[PDB]
Tab-separated table of N, CA, C and O in Angstrom:
chain	number	residue	atom	x	y	z
A	1395	UNK	N	-226.941	-85.619	102.736
A	1395	UNK	CA	-226.675	-86.802	103.547
A	1395	UNK	C	-225.728	-87.758	102.833
A	1395	UNK	O	-224.807	-88.307	103.450
A	1396	UNK	N	-225.932	-87.963	101.528
A	1396	UNK	CA	-225.055	-88.853	100.775
A	1396	UNK	C	-223.634	-88.306	100.718
A	1396	UNK	O	-222.665	-89.061	100.866
A	1397	UNK	N	-223.489	-86.994	100.514
A	1397	UNK	CA	-222.160	-86.395	100.480
A	1397	UNK	C	-221.475	-86.501	101.836
A	1397	UNK	O	-220.280	-86.804	101.908
A	1398	UNK	N	-222.217	-86.265	102.922
A	1398	UNK	CA	-221.636	-86.375	104.256
A	1398	UNK	C	-221.193	-87.806	104.530
A	1398	UNK	O	-220.111	-88.042	105.082
A	1399	UNK	N	-222.017	-88.785	104.142
A	1399	UNK	CA	-221.657	-90.182	104.362
A	1399	UNK	C	-220.425	-90.570	103.552
A	1399	UNK	O	-219.515	-91.229	104.071
A	1400	UNK	N	-220.374	-90.165	102.280
A	1400	UNK	CA	-219.231	-90.505	101.440
A	1400	UNK	C	-217.967	-89.826	101.953
A	1400	UNK	O	-216.872	-90.398	101.889
A	1401	UNK	N	-218.093	-88.604	102.477
A	1401	UNK	CA	-216.926	-87.905	103.005
A	1401	UNK	C	-216.436	-88.547	104.296
A	1401	UNK	O	-215.225	-88.661	104.517
A	1402	UNK	N	-217.360	-88.972	105.162
A	1402	UNK	CA	-216.958	-89.630	106.401
A	1402	UNK	C	-216.355	-90.998	106.115
A	1402	UNK	O	-215.479	-91.464	106.853
A	1403	UNK	N	-216.805	-91.665	105.049
A	1403	UNK	CA	-216.244	-92.968	104.706
A	1403	UNK	C	-214.869	-92.824	104.064
A	1403	UNK	O	-213.943	-93.581	104.379
A	1404	UNK	N	-214.715	-91.858	103.160
A	1404	UNK	CA	-213.465	-91.643	102.446
A	1404	UNK	C	-212.542	-90.652	103.145
A	1404	UNK	O	-211.606	-90.148	102.516
A	1405	UNK	N	-212.779	-90.363	104.417
A	1405	UNK	CA	-211.939	-89.446	105.175
A	1405	UNK	C	-210.638	-90.144	105.555
A	1405	UNK	O	-210.429	-91.327	105.270
A	1406	UNK	N	-209.722	-89.432	106.213
A	1406	UNK	CA	-208.470	-90.072	106.634
A	1406	UNK	C	-208.692	-91.043	107.782
A	1406	UNK	O	-208.911	-90.627	108.924
A	1407	UNK	N	-208.636	-92.339	107.487
A	1407	UNK	CA	-208.865	-93.379	108.488
A	1407	UNK	C	-207.534	-93.692	109.159
A	1407	UNK	O	-206.760	-94.522	108.677
A	1408	UNK	N	-207.165	-92.935	110.191
A	1408	UNK	CA	-205.837	-93.149	110.788
A	1408	UNK	C	-205.635	-92.824	112.264
A	1408	UNK	O	-205.846	-93.665	113.138
A	1409	UNK	N	-205.202	-91.592	112.525
A	1409	UNK	CA	-204.902	-91.134	113.880
A	1409	UNK	C	-206.085	-90.601	114.689
A	1409	UNK	O	-205.979	-89.556	115.329
A	1410	UNK	N	-207.201	-91.324	114.670
A	1410	UNK	CA	-208.378	-90.939	115.437
A	1410	UNK	C	-208.119	-91.326	116.890
A	1410	UNK	O	-208.594	-90.670	117.816
A	1411	UNK	N	-207.354	-92.400	117.072
A	1411	UNK	CA	-206.976	-92.883	118.390
A	1411	UNK	C	-205.681	-92.184	118.793
A	1411	UNK	O	-205.659	-90.960	118.930
A	1412	UNK	N	-204.604	-92.952	118.955
A	1412	UNK	CA	-203.315	-92.376	119.344
A	1412	UNK	C	-202.085	-93.224	119.007
A	1412	UNK	O	-200.996	-92.922	119.496
A	1413	UNK	N	-202.222	-94.260	118.178
A	1413	UNK	CA	-201.055	-95.088	117.894
A	1413	UNK	C	-200.597	-95.021	116.447
A	1413	UNK	O	-199.393	-94.943	116.191
A	1414	UNK	N	-201.529	-95.053	115.490
A	1414	UNK	CA	-201.146	-94.997	114.083
A	1414	UNK	C	-200.490	-93.666	113.741
A	1414	UNK	O	-199.477	-93.627	113.033
A	1415	UNK	N	-201.057	-92.562	114.237
A	1415	UNK	CA	-200.466	-91.251	113.989
A	1415	UNK	C	-199.084	-91.145	114.619
A	1415	UNK	O	-198.161	-90.585	114.016
A	1416	UNK	N	-198.920	-91.687	115.828
A	1416	UNK	CA	-197.616	-91.651	116.483
A	1416	UNK	C	-196.585	-92.466	115.711
A	1416	UNK	O	-195.441	-92.028	115.541
A	1417	UNK	N	-196.971	-93.651	115.229
A	1417	UNK	CA	-196.044	-94.471	114.457
A	1417	UNK	C	-195.675	-93.799	113.139
A	1417	UNK	O	-194.507	-93.824	112.727
A	1418	UNK	N	-196.655	-93.192	112.464
A	1418	UNK	CA	-196.367	-92.484	111.222
A	1418	UNK	C	-195.439	-91.301	111.467
A	1418	UNK	O	-194.512	-91.057	110.687
A	1419	UNK	N	-195.666	-90.562	112.557
A	1419	UNK	CA	-194.798	-89.435	112.881
A	1419	UNK	C	-193.387	-89.903	113.212
A	1419	UNK	O	-192.410	-89.255	112.825
A	1420	UNK	N	-193.260	-91.027	113.920
A	1420	UNK	CA	-191.934	-91.554	114.237
A	1420	UNK	C	-191.197	-91.993	112.977
A	1420	UNK	O	-189.999	-91.725	112.825
A	1421	UNK	N	-191.897	-92.672	112.063
A	1421	UNK	CA	-191.269	-93.076	110.808
A	1421	UNK	C	-190.861	-91.862	109.982
A	1421	UNK	O	-189.771	-91.836	109.393
A	1422	UNK	N	-191.722	-90.841	109.929
A	1422	UNK	CA	-191.386	-89.625	109.199
A	1422	UNK	C	-190.188	-88.922	109.825
A	1422	UNK	O	-189.329	-88.394	109.112
A	1423	UNK	N	-190.105	-88.919	111.158
A	1423	UNK	CA	-188.974	-88.289	111.830
A	1423	UNK	C	-187.681	-89.049	111.566
A	1423	UNK	O	-186.625	-88.437	111.378
A	1424	UNK	N	-187.743	-90.383	111.544
A	1424	UNK	CA	-186.551	-91.165	111.225
A	1424	UNK	C	-186.094	-90.914	109.791
A	1424	UNK	O	-184.895	-90.737	109.533
A	1425	UNK	N	-187.039	-90.899	108.846
A	1425	UNK	CA	-186.692	-90.600	107.461
A	1425	UNK	C	-186.109	-89.199	107.330
A	1425	UNK	O	-185.143	-88.985	106.587
A	1426	UNK	N	-186.675	-88.232	108.057
A	1426	UNK	CA	-186.169	-86.867	108.008
A	1426	UNK	C	-184.775	-86.775	108.609
A	1426	UNK	O	-183.935	-86.018	108.117
A	1427	UNK	N	-184.504	-87.543	109.665
A	1427	UNK	CA	-183.168	-87.547	110.253
A	1427	UNK	C	-182.146	-88.142	109.293
A	1427	UNK	O	-181.035	-87.615	109.154
A	1428	UNK	N	-182.505	-89.237	108.620
A	1428	UNK	CA	-181.601	-89.819	107.630
A	1428	UNK	C	-181.343	-88.845	106.484
A	1428	UNK	O	-180.195	-88.657	106.050
A	1429	UNK	N	-182.406	-88.208	105.984
A	1429	UNK	CA	-182.253	-87.241	104.903
A	1429	UNK	C	-181.424	-86.043	105.345
A	1429	UNK	O	-180.640	-85.501	104.562
A	1430	UNK	N	-181.576	-85.623	106.603
A	1430	UNK	CA	-180.804	-84.496	107.111
A	1430	UNK	C	-179.334	-84.857	107.257
A	1430	UNK	O	-178.462	-84.027	106.994
A	1431	UNK	N	-179.039	-86.091	107.671
A	1431	UNK	CA	-177.648	-86.532	107.721
A	1431	UNK	C	-177.030	-86.556	106.326
A	1431	UNK	O	-175.897	-86.093	106.129
A	1432	UNK	N	-177.765	-87.089	105.346
A	1432	UNK	CA	-177.266	-87.104	103.972
A	1432	UNK	C	-177.040	-85.686	103.454
A	1432	UNK	O	-176.013	-85.394	102.826
A	1433	UNK	N	-177.997	-84.790	103.711
A	1433	UNK	CA	-177.869	-83.406	103.272
A	1433	UNK	C	-176.718	-82.698	103.971
A	1433	UNK	O	-176.047	-81.866	103.356
A	1434	UNK	N	-176.468	-83.017	105.242
A	1434	UNK	CA	-175.343	-82.419	105.949
A	1434	UNK	C	-174.020	-82.894	105.367
A	1434	UNK	O	-173.085	-82.099	105.213
A	1435	UNK	N	-173.922	-84.182	105.032
A	1435	UNK	CA	-172.714	-84.681	104.379
A	1435	UNK	C	-172.495	-83.991	103.034
A	1435	UNK	O	-171.377	-83.565	102.708
A	1436	UNK	N	-173.563	-83.862	102.243
A	1436	UNK	CA	-173.448	-83.225	100.932
A	1436	UNK	C	-173.062	-81.757	101.080
A	1436	UNK	O	-172.244	-81.233	100.311
A	1437	UNK	N	-173.637	-81.073	102.069
A	1437	UNK	CA	-173.342	-79.660	102.274
A	1437	UNK	C	-171.914	-79.478	102.767
A	1437	UNK	O	-171.246	-78.503	102.414
A	1438	UNK	N	-171.422	-80.410	103.585
A	1438	UNK	CA	-170.029	-80.346	104.014
A	1438	UNK	C	-169.086	-80.536	102.836
A	1438	UNK	O	-168.082	-79.824	102.716
A	1439	UNK	N	-169.396	-81.487	101.950
A	1439	UNK	CA	-168.581	-81.664	100.751
A	1439	UNK	C	-168.599	-80.409	99.881
A	1439	UNK	O	-167.551	-79.967	99.387
A	1440	UNK	N	-169.780	-79.820	99.688
A	1440	UNK	CA	-169.872	-78.614	98.880
A	1440	UNK	C	-169.138	-77.437	99.495
A	1440	UNK	O	-168.502	-76.652	98.787
A	1441	UNK	N	-169.212	-77.300	100.820
A	1441	UNK	CA	-168.499	-76.223	101.497
A	1441	UNK	C	-166.993	-76.430	101.419
A	1441	UNK	O	-166.238	-75.463	101.285
A	1442	UNK	N	-166.536	-77.683	101.496
A	1442	UNK	CA	-165.114	-77.957	101.315
A	1442	UNK	C	-164.662	-77.590	99.907
A	1442	UNK	O	-163.593	-76.995	99.724
A	1443	UNK	N	-165.469	-77.934	98.899
A	1443	UNK	CA	-165.129	-77.563	97.527
A	1443	UNK	C	-165.091	-76.049	97.359
A	1443	UNK	O	-164.185	-75.508	96.711
A	1444	UNK	N	-166.066	-75.347	97.942
A	1444	UNK	CA	-166.096	-73.891	97.845
A	1444	UNK	C	-164.903	-73.265	98.558
A	1444	UNK	O	-164.335	-72.277	98.082
A	1445	UNK	N	-164.507	-73.830	99.700
A	1445	UNK	CA	-163.343	-73.316	100.416
A	1445	UNK	C	-162.066	-73.548	99.622
A	1445	UNK	O	-161.183	-72.683	99.591
A	1446	UNK	N	-161.950	-74.708	98.971
A	1446	UNK	CA	-160.791	-74.958	98.119
A	1446	UNK	C	-160.748	-73.980	96.951
A	1446	UNK	O	-159.680	-73.458	96.606
A	1447	UNK	N	-161.904	-73.710	96.342
A	1447	UNK	CA	-161.953	-72.762	95.232
A	1447	UNK	C	-161.586	-71.361	95.706
A	1447	UNK	O	-160.871	-70.624	95.015
A	1448	UNK	N	-162.062	-70.971	96.891
A	1448	UNK	CA	-161.739	-69.650	97.422
A	1448	UNK	C	-160.257	-69.536	97.753
A	1448	UNK	O	-159.643	-68.488	97.519
A	1449	UNK	N	-159.663	-70.602	98.293
A	1449	UNK	CA	-158.232	-70.588	98.569
A	1449	UNK	C	-157.427	-70.487	97.281
A	1449	UNK	O	-156.435	-69.752	97.215
A	1450	UNK	N	-157.847	-71.213	96.241
A	1450	UNK	CA	-157.164	-71.116	94.953
A	1450	UNK	C	-157.281	-69.714	94.371
A	1450	UNK	O	-156.310	-69.176	93.826
A	1451	UNK	N	-158.462	-69.100	94.487
A	1451	UNK	CA	-158.644	-67.743	93.982
A	1451	UNK	C	-157.785	-66.748	94.751
A	1451	UNK	O	-157.187	-65.843	94.158
A	1452	UNK	N	-157.706	-66.902	96.075
A	1452	UNK	CA	-156.871	-66.012	96.874
A	1452	UNK	C	-155.398	-66.182	96.530
A	1452	UNK	O	-154.650	-65.199	96.465
A	1453	UNK	N	-154.963	-67.423	96.299
A	1453	UNK	CA	-153.573	-67.659	95.923
A	1453	UNK	C	-153.268	-67.080	94.547
A	1453	UNK	O	-152.171	-66.556	94.318
A	1454	UNK	N	-154.223	-67.167	93.619
A	1454	UNK	CA	-154.020	-66.594	92.293
A	1454	UNK	C	-153.967	-65.073	92.371
A	1454	UNK	O	-153.171	-64.429	91.676
A	1455	UNK	N	-154.809	-64.474	93.216
A	1455	UNK	CA	-154.800	-63.022	93.361
A	1455	UNK	C	-153.554	-62.537	94.090
A	1455	UNK	O	-153.112	-61.404	93.868
A	1456	UNK	N	-152.978	-63.372	94.958
A	1456	UNK	CA	-151.775	-62.981	95.682
A	1456	UNK	C	-150.562	-62.861	94.770
A	1456	UNK	O	-149.594	-62.183	95.133
A	1457	UNK	N	-150.588	-63.496	93.603
A	1457	UNK	CA	-149.476	-63.423	92.664
A	1457	UNK	C	-149.393	-62.042	92.020
A	1457	UNK	O	-150.307	-61.228	92.152
B	1352	UNK	N	-118.007	-46.656	65.345
B	1352	UNK	CA	-118.334	-45.539	64.468
B	1352	UNK	C	-117.351	-45.446	63.308
B	1352	UNK	O	-116.424	-44.635	63.331
B	1353	UNK	N	-117.555	-46.290	62.298
B	1353	UNK	CA	-116.693	-46.251	61.124
B	1353	UNK	C	-116.771	-44.931	60.365
B	1353	UNK	O	-115.799	-44.605	59.661
B	1354	UNK	N	-117.853	-44.151	60.451
B	1354	UNK	CA	-117.904	-42.907	59.664
B	1354	UNK	C	-116.864	-41.887	60.086
B	1354	UNK	O	-116.227	-41.273	59.221
B	1355	UNK	N	-116.668	-41.687	61.391
B	1355	UNK	CA	-115.674	-40.721	61.848
B	1355	UNK	C	-114.265	-41.154	61.462
B	1355	UNK	O	-113.445	-40.329	61.042
B	1356	UNK	N	-113.968	-42.449	61.593
B	1356	UNK	CA	-112.647	-42.951	61.224
B	1356	UNK	C	-112.415	-42.790	59.728
B	1356	UNK	O	-111.328	-42.390	59.293
B	1357	UNK	N	-113.433	-43.092	58.917
B	1357	UNK	CA	-113.296	-42.934	57.472
B	1357	UNK	C	-113.112	-41.471	57.092
B	1357	UNK	O	-112.318	-41.148	56.201
B	1358	UNK	N	-113.833	-40.568	57.763
B	1358	UNK	CA	-113.679	-39.144	57.485
B	1358	UNK	C	-112.284	-38.658	57.856
B	1358	UNK	O	-111.674	-37.883	57.112
B	1359	UNK	N	-111.764	-39.106	59.002
B	1359	UNK	CA	-110.415	-38.715	59.405
B	1359	UNK	C	-109.388	-39.254	58.420
B	1359	UNK	O	-108.429	-38.559	58.056
B	1360	UNK	N	-109.574	-40.496	57.962
B	1360	UNK	CA	-108.642	-41.084	57.005
B	1360	UNK	C	-108.674	-40.320	55.689
B	1360	UNK	O	-107.629	-40.055	55.082
B	1361	UNK	N	-109.872	-39.950	55.228
B	1361	UNK	CA	-109.984	-39.195	53.984
B	1361	UNK	C	-109.362	-37.812	54.117
B	1361	UNK	O	-108.697	-37.333	53.191
B	1362	UNK	N	-109.559	-37.155	55.263
B	1362	UNK	CA	-108.977	-35.832	55.465
B	1362	UNK	C	-107.457	-35.902	55.549
B	1362	UNK	O	-106.763	-34.990	55.086
B	1363	UNK	N	-106.923	-36.977	56.134
B	1363	UNK	CA	-105.474	-37.119	56.223
B	1363	UNK	C	-104.867	-37.473	54.870
B	1363	UNK	O	-103.767	-37.017	54.540
B	1364	UNK	N	-105.567	-38.286	54.076
B	1364	UNK	CA	-105.041	-38.669	52.770
B	1364	UNK	C	-105.172	-37.531	51.765
B	1364	UNK	O	-104.370	-37.428	50.829
B	1365	UNK	N	-106.173	-36.667	51.939
B	1365	UNK	CA	-106.412	-35.546	51.040
B	1365	UNK	C	-105.983	-34.215	51.647
B	1365	UNK	O	-106.529	-33.165	51.289
B	1366	UNK	N	-105.016	-34.237	52.566
B	1366	UNK	CA	-104.512	-32.989	53.133
B	1366	UNK	C	-103.799	-32.155	52.077
B	1366	UNK	O	-104.209	-31.025	51.788
B	1367	UNK	N	-102.723	-32.697	51.487
B	1367	UNK	CA	-102.064	-31.992	50.389
B	1367	UNK	C	-102.828	-32.171	49.085
B	1367	UNK	O	-103.082	-31.172	48.390
B	1368	UNK	N	-103.221	-33.383	48.690
B	1368	UNK	CA	-104.005	-33.568	47.450
B	1368	UNK	C	-105.507	-33.412	47.679
B	1368	UNK	O	-106.269	-34.368	47.820
B	1369	UNK	N	-105.953	-32.158	47.720
B	1369	UNK	CA	-107.357	-31.842	47.954
B	1369	UNK	C	-108.205	-31.916	46.689
B	1369	UNK	O	-108.912	-30.950	46.379
B	1370	UNK	N	-108.158	-33.034	45.959
B	1370	UNK	CA	-108.966	-33.161	44.750
B	1370	UNK	C	-110.454	-33.217	45.069
B	1370	UNK	O	-111.223	-32.382	44.579
B	1371	UNK	N	-110.876	-34.181	45.883
B	1371	UNK	CA	-112.276	-34.274	46.270
B	1371	UNK	C	-112.418	-34.061	47.771
B	1371	UNK	O	-112.108	-34.951	48.570
B	1372	UNK	N	-112.890	-32.875	48.156
B	1372	UNK	CA	-113.067	-32.515	49.557
B	1372	UNK	C	-114.416	-32.968	50.104
B	1372	UNK	O	-115.404	-32.229	50.017
B	1373	UNK	N	-114.478	-34.175	50.662
B	1373	UNK	CA	-115.711	-34.701	51.230
B	1373	UNK	C	-115.843	-34.428	52.723
B	1373	UNK	O	-116.600	-35.134	53.397
B	1374	UNK	N	-115.129	-33.432	53.253
B	1374	UNK	CA	-115.205	-33.135	54.680
B	1374	UNK	C	-116.607	-32.682	55.070
B	1374	UNK	O	-117.162	-33.128	56.081
B	1375	UNK	N	-117.198	-31.791	54.270
B	1375	UNK	CA	-118.547	-31.318	54.560
B	1375	UNK	C	-119.571	-32.437	54.450
B	1375	UNK	O	-120.474	-32.537	55.289
B	1376	UNK	N	-119.456	-33.279	53.420
B	1376	UNK	CA	-120.374	-34.403	53.273
B	1376	UNK	C	-120.259	-35.359	54.452
B	1376	UNK	O	-121.269	-35.841	54.977
B	1377	UNK	N	-119.028	-35.637	54.890
B	1377	UNK	CA	-118.829	-36.524	56.030
B	1377	UNK	C	-119.402	-35.924	57.307
B	1377	UNK	O	-120.033	-36.630	58.100
B	1378	UNK	N	-119.197	-34.622	57.521
B	1378	UNK	CA	-119.734	-33.974	58.713
B	1378	UNK	C	-121.258	-33.989	58.706
B	1378	UNK	O	-121.895	-34.251	59.733
B	1379	UNK	N	-121.861	-33.713	57.546
B	1379	UNK	CA	-123.316	-33.732	57.445
B	1379	UNK	C	-123.865	-35.136	57.669
B	1379	UNK	O	-124.883	-35.311	58.350
B	1380	UNK	N	-123.201	-36.150	57.109
B	1380	UNK	CA	-123.644	-37.524	57.312
B	1380	UNK	C	-123.518	-37.932	58.774
B	1380	UNK	O	-124.395	-38.615	59.313
B	1381	UNK	N	-122.437	-37.511	59.437
B	1381	UNK	CA	-122.269	-37.827	60.850
B	1381	UNK	C	-123.341	-37.154	61.696
B	1381	UNK	O	-123.909	-37.777	62.601
B	1382	UNK	N	-123.639	-35.884	61.410
B	1382	UNK	CA	-124.685	-35.187	62.152
B	1382	UNK	C	-126.045	-35.839	61.931
B	1382	UNK	O	-126.822	-36.011	62.879
B	1383	UNK	N	-126.346	-36.221	60.687
B	1383	UNK	CA	-127.626	-36.859	60.400
B	1383	UNK	C	-127.731	-38.221	61.075
B	1383	UNK	O	-128.793	-38.582	61.595
B	1384	UNK	N	-126.637	-38.987	61.088
B	1384	UNK	CA	-126.660	-40.290	61.744
B	1384	UNK	C	-126.799	-40.140	63.253
B	1384	UNK	O	-127.476	-40.945	63.904
B	1385	UNK	N	-126.173	-39.111	63.829
B	1385	UNK	CA	-126.323	-38.862	65.258
B	1385	UNK	C	-127.745	-38.435	65.595
B	1385	UNK	O	-128.276	-38.800	66.651
B	1386	UNK	N	-128.377	-37.660	64.712
B	1386	UNK	CA	-129.749	-37.230	64.958
B	1386	UNK	C	-130.732	-38.384	64.791
B	1386	UNK	O	-131.737	-38.458	65.507
B	1387	UNK	N	-130.460	-39.292	63.851
B	1387	UNK	CA	-131.391	-40.380	63.575
B	1387	UNK	C	-131.213	-41.558	64.523
B	1387	UNK	O	-132.177	-42.287	64.783
B	1388	UNK	N	-130.002	-41.769	65.045
B	1388	UNK	CA	-129.764	-42.912	65.919
B	1388	UNK	C	-130.437	-42.706	67.270
B	1388	UNK	O	-131.139	-43.592	67.772
B	1389	UNK	N	-130.241	-41.540	67.877
B	1389	UNK	CA	-130.828	-41.247	69.172
B	1389	UNK	C	-130.066	-41.865	70.328
B	1389	UNK	O	-129.835	-43.074	70.357
B	1390	UNK	N	-126.731	-46.004	79.495
B	1390	UNK	CA	-126.232	-46.721	80.672
B	1390	UNK	C	-126.815	-48.124	80.793
B	1390	UNK	O	-127.503	-48.586	79.882
B	1391	UNK	N	-126.542	-48.790	81.913
B	1391	UNK	CA	-127.051	-50.131	82.167
B	1391	UNK	C	-128.496	-50.135	82.652
B	1391	UNK	O	-128.974	-51.176	83.117
B	1392	UNK	N	-129.192	-48.999	82.563
B	1392	UNK	CA	-130.594	-48.957	82.965
B	1392	UNK	C	-131.442	-49.866	82.086
B	1392	UNK	O	-132.363	-50.531	82.574
B	1393	UNK	N	-131.144	-49.909	80.785
B	1393	UNK	CA	-131.864	-50.813	79.894
B	1393	UNK	C	-131.615	-52.268	80.270
B	1393	UNK	O	-132.536	-53.092	80.243
B	1394	UNK	N	-130.374	-52.603	80.633
B	1394	UNK	CA	-130.067	-53.968	81.046
B	1394	UNK	C	-130.791	-54.329	82.338
B	1394	UNK	O	-131.307	-55.444	82.477
B	1395	UNK	N	-130.841	-53.398	83.292
B	1395	UNK	CA	-131.558	-53.655	84.536
B	1395	UNK	C	-133.051	-53.828	84.284
B	1395	UNK	O	-133.693	-54.703	84.878
B	1396	UNK	N	-133.621	-53.003	83.401
B	1396	UNK	CA	-135.032	-53.140	83.064
B	1396	UNK	C	-135.307	-54.475	82.385
B	1396	UNK	O	-136.324	-55.121	82.660
B	1397	UNK	N	-134.410	-54.907	81.496
B	1397	UNK	CA	-134.584	-56.197	80.837
B	1397	UNK	C	-134.488	-57.344	81.834
B	1397	UNK	O	-135.251	-58.312	81.749
B	1398	UNK	N	-133.561	-57.249	82.792
B	1398	UNK	CA	-133.452	-58.284	83.815
B	1398	UNK	C	-134.705	-58.332	84.682
B	1398	UNK	O	-135.203	-59.417	85.009
B	1399	UNK	N	-135.229	-57.164	85.059
B	1399	UNK	CA	-136.458	-57.123	85.847
B	1399	UNK	C	-137.630	-57.702	85.066
B	1399	UNK	O	-138.455	-58.437	85.623
B	1400	UNK	N	-137.718	-57.388	83.771
B	1400	UNK	CA	-138.797	-57.926	82.950
B	1400	UNK	C	-138.682	-59.438	82.805
B	1400	UNK	O	-139.693	-60.148	82.842
B	1401	UNK	N	-137.459	-59.949	82.647
B	1401	UNK	CA	-137.270	-61.393	82.558
B	1401	UNK	C	-137.648	-62.080	83.864
B	1401	UNK	O	-138.293	-63.136	83.853
B	1402	UNK	N	-137.259	-61.495	84.999
B	1402	UNK	CA	-137.636	-62.065	86.288
B	1402	UNK	C	-139.149	-62.050	86.474
B	1402	UNK	O	-139.731	-63.021	86.973
B	1403	UNK	N	-139.804	-60.960	86.070
B	1403	UNK	CA	-141.256	-60.880	86.192
B	1403	UNK	C	-141.945	-61.895	85.289
B	1403	UNK	O	-142.945	-62.506	85.684
B	1404	UNK	N	-141.423	-62.095	84.079
B	1404	UNK	CA	-142.007	-63.077	83.171
B	1404	UNK	C	-141.823	-64.486	83.721
B	1404	UNK	O	-142.725	-65.327	83.624
B	1405	UNK	N	-140.657	-64.766	84.308
B	1405	UNK	CA	-140.434	-66.071	84.922
B	1405	UNK	C	-141.380	-66.293	86.096
B	1405	UNK	O	-141.933	-67.388	86.260
B	1406	UNK	N	-141.579	-65.264	86.922
B	1406	UNK	CA	-142.508	-65.381	88.041
B	1406	UNK	C	-143.933	-65.605	87.553
B	1406	UNK	O	-144.675	-66.410	88.129
B	1407	UNK	N	-144.335	-64.904	86.490
B	1407	UNK	CA	-145.675	-65.086	85.944
B	1407	UNK	C	-145.853	-66.488	85.376
B	1407	UNK	O	-146.908	-67.108	85.557
B	1408	UNK	N	-144.833	-67.006	84.689
B	1408	UNK	CA	-144.912	-68.364	84.162
B	1408	UNK	C	-144.996	-69.386	85.289
B	1408	UNK	O	-145.760	-70.354	85.205
B	1409	UNK	N	-144.218	-69.184	86.356
B	1409	UNK	CA	-144.284	-70.088	87.500
B	1409	UNK	C	-145.657	-70.042	88.158
B	1409	UNK	O	-146.204	-71.081	88.546
B	1410	UNK	N	-146.233	-68.845	88.289
B	1410	UNK	CA	-147.560	-68.722	88.881
B	1410	UNK	C	-148.618	-69.383	88.008
B	1410	UNK	O	-149.549	-70.015	88.521
B	1411	UNK	N	-148.495	-69.249	86.686
B	1411	UNK	CA	-149.448	-69.887	85.786
B	1411	UNK	C	-149.322	-71.405	85.834
B	1411	UNK	O	-150.328	-72.120	85.770
B	1412	UNK	N	-148.094	-71.914	85.950
B	1412	UNK	CA	-147.886	-73.353	86.047
B	1412	UNK	C	-148.254	-73.907	87.416
B	1412	UNK	O	-148.465	-75.118	87.544
B	1413	UNK	N	-148.334	-73.053	88.440
B	1413	UNK	CA	-148.713	-73.525	89.768
B	1413	UNK	C	-150.160	-73.998	89.804
B	1413	UNK	O	-150.523	-74.818	90.654
B	1414	UNK	N	-150.999	-73.495	88.895
B	1414	UNK	CA	-152.397	-73.897	88.809
B	1414	UNK	C	-152.628	-74.995	87.778
B	1414	UNK	O	-153.711	-75.062	87.180
B	1415	UNK	N	-151.636	-75.855	87.550
B	1415	UNK	CA	-151.784	-76.923	86.564
B	1415	UNK	C	-152.620	-78.070	87.121
B	1415	UNK	O	-153.644	-78.449	86.539
B	1416	UNK	N	-152.200	-78.635	88.249
B	1416	UNK	CA	-152.909	-79.757	88.848
B	1416	UNK	C	-154.195	-79.273	89.505
B	1416	UNK	O	-154.160	-78.480	90.452
B	1417	UNK	N	-155.331	-79.755	89.002
B	1417	UNK	CA	-156.630	-79.359	89.539
B	1417	UNK	C	-157.636	-80.450	89.200
B	1417	UNK	O	-157.968	-80.640	88.025
B	1418	UNK	N	-158.113	-81.161	90.220
B	1418	UNK	CA	-159.103	-82.214	90.024
B	1418	UNK	C	-160.528	-81.681	90.142
B	1418	UNK	O	-161.353	-81.903	89.251
B	1419	UNK	N	-160.829	-80.981	91.232
B	1419	UNK	CA	-162.157	-80.419	91.439
B	1419	UNK	C	-162.088	-79.167	92.308
B	1419	UNK	O	-161.003	-78.696	92.647
């Protein structure tokens, strides 16, 4: 009984209803969208660098 | 080829006065020099090699500027 009571008290006090969980999910989705935009910019820069390196290698091999 | 000219000069000068007959020595020396010495094909090959070296240097210098 003591363990059950302590577990029910120290459980996740949050999305039992329907608003706190929704707000947390919306904030997480916004953070994930920002992180995905940053990662897409970084990946585009890296792909541009790789394409430049590949073009330089092809030009060197063409000689 | 100074050897052939020198041999001819010696043979002409020693035609009547045959004191020292170096005709055989001169002929042997000429044959040995011809054996040891051994067209514009060499010039064309050198020109092609120079052009190739210039092209290689230009290609190597083409990759000078590189930031990232």
